[PDB]
Amino acid sequence: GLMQFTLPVRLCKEIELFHFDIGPFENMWPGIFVYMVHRSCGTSCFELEKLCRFIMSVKKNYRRVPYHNWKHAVTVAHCMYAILQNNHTLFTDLERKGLLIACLCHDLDHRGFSNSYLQKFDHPLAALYSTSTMEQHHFSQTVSILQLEGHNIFSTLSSSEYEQVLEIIRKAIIATDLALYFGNRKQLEEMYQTGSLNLNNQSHRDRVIGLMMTACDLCSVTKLWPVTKLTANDIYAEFWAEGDEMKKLGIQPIPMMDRDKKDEVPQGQLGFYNAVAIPCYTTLTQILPPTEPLLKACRDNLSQWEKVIRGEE
Numbered sequence: 001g002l003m004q005f006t007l008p009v010r011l012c013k014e015i016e017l018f019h020f021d022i023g024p025f026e027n028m029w030p031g032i033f034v035y036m037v038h039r040s041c042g043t044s045c046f047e048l049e050k051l052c053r054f055i056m057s058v059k060k061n062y063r064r065v066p067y068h069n070w071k072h073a074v075t076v077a078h079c080m081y082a083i084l085q086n087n088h089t090l091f092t093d094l095e096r097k098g099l100l101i102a103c104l105c106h107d108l109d110h111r112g113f114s115n116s117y118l119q120k121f122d123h124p125l126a127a128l129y130s131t132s133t134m135e136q137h138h139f140s141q142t143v144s145i146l147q148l149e150g151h152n153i154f155s156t157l158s159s160s161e162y163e164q165v166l167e168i169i170r171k172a173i174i175a176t177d178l179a180l181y182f183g184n185r186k187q188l189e190e191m192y193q194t195g196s197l198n199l200n201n202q203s204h205r206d207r208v209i210g211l212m213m214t215a216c217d218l219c220s221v222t223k224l225w226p227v228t229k230l231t232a233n234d235i236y237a238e239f240w241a242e243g244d245e246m247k248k249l250g251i252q253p254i255p256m257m258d259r260d261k262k263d264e265v266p267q268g269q270l271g272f273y274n275a276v277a278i279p280c281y282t283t284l285t286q287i288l289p290p291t292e293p294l295l296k297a298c299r300d301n302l303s304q305w306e307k308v309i310r311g312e313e
């Protein structure tokens with residue numbers, strides 16, 4: 001009970017900032033996650049023995065793909081940590097517990113392919129779940145791991161608190177389906193501007209937690225330019241692999257995914273910052289003013305992609 005995790009000074013300070021990079025030392029990522037849980041939640045939220053066993057089973061069930069991997073899991077959990085710490089009083093005990101676990105689990109057993117590719121492939125998971133295919137699988141794997149002997153980090157919740165936290169985690173993971181993001185932000189935009197947004201309305205919290213999840217999931221666009229630039233390589237390596245597999249099914253992939261059309265990437269990143277990222281962190285800043293640094297960092301990187309196009313790097 002008296003066993004804190006402590007990090008080296010540079011990490012101890014930088015981890016509090018939205019733009020923190022968890023680094024290339026895999027073996028430190030579990031301790032980073034626990035540190036965050038302890039400061040975000042308490043030293044008491046989870047039995048350390050069970051948490052550690054839950055973390056290492058979650059790690060095992062992320063695959064060795066270029067981007068949708070264990071590092072992404074922890075990166076996305078860190079962004080949620082930064083949002084929760086800069087918005088101390090807005091979130092219940094259960095939400096703080098549930099959301100860091102949601103973020104760590106959100107891409108469990110991802111194979112590096114989109115919901116579209118599963119459906120064109122006719123992957124079994126596409127028959128089991130017609131929408132938010134991978135996201136329903138990710139929630140399914142989370143529940144599977146939670147039910148391994150020794151792994152129930154929630155065992156000390158009441159029956160009804162347990163049901164609420166698994167419901168927070170399910171909606172949180174489903175919301176990482178970018179197809180659902182557009183409508184979810186449109187509604188939050190209207191609710192904010194007409195003044196009807198009410199954080200005591202459960203259906204409204206759900207929407208706001210969904211946007212937080214989109215923001216954490218996209219947080220690679222809110223890092224320092226060199227982190228953003230190198231992560232984009234990993235993202236495009238999955239896209240081009242998926243484009244290769246589309247060609248194998250006899251389908252010309254969208255250009256984003258065509259490795260013959262790399263030249264078009266900087267313009268494609270422009271489109272994405274403008275269509276998805278900027279609107280996402282704008283609406284999030286409006287709802288949760290202290291998340292402004294994510295918007296500012298996102299704008300800085302949009303500006304960096306504009307420079308790539310103009311031939312200035």
Ligand SMILES: CN(C)c1nc2cc(Br)ccn2n1
Pocket residue numbers: 217218219220221232235256268269272
């Ligand atoms: C090109 N689009 C779909 C895309 N998706 C992402 C997600 C993140 Br994080 C960063 C860049 N991109 N680029």
Ligand SMILES: [Br-]
Pocket residue numbers: 220221228229231232235
């Ligand atoms: Br990126």
Ligand SMILES: [Mg+2]
Pocket residue numbers: 106107134176
């Ligand atoms: Mg995902």
Ligand SMILES: [Zn+2]
Pocket residue numbers: 072076106107176217
């Ligand atoms: Zn993700």
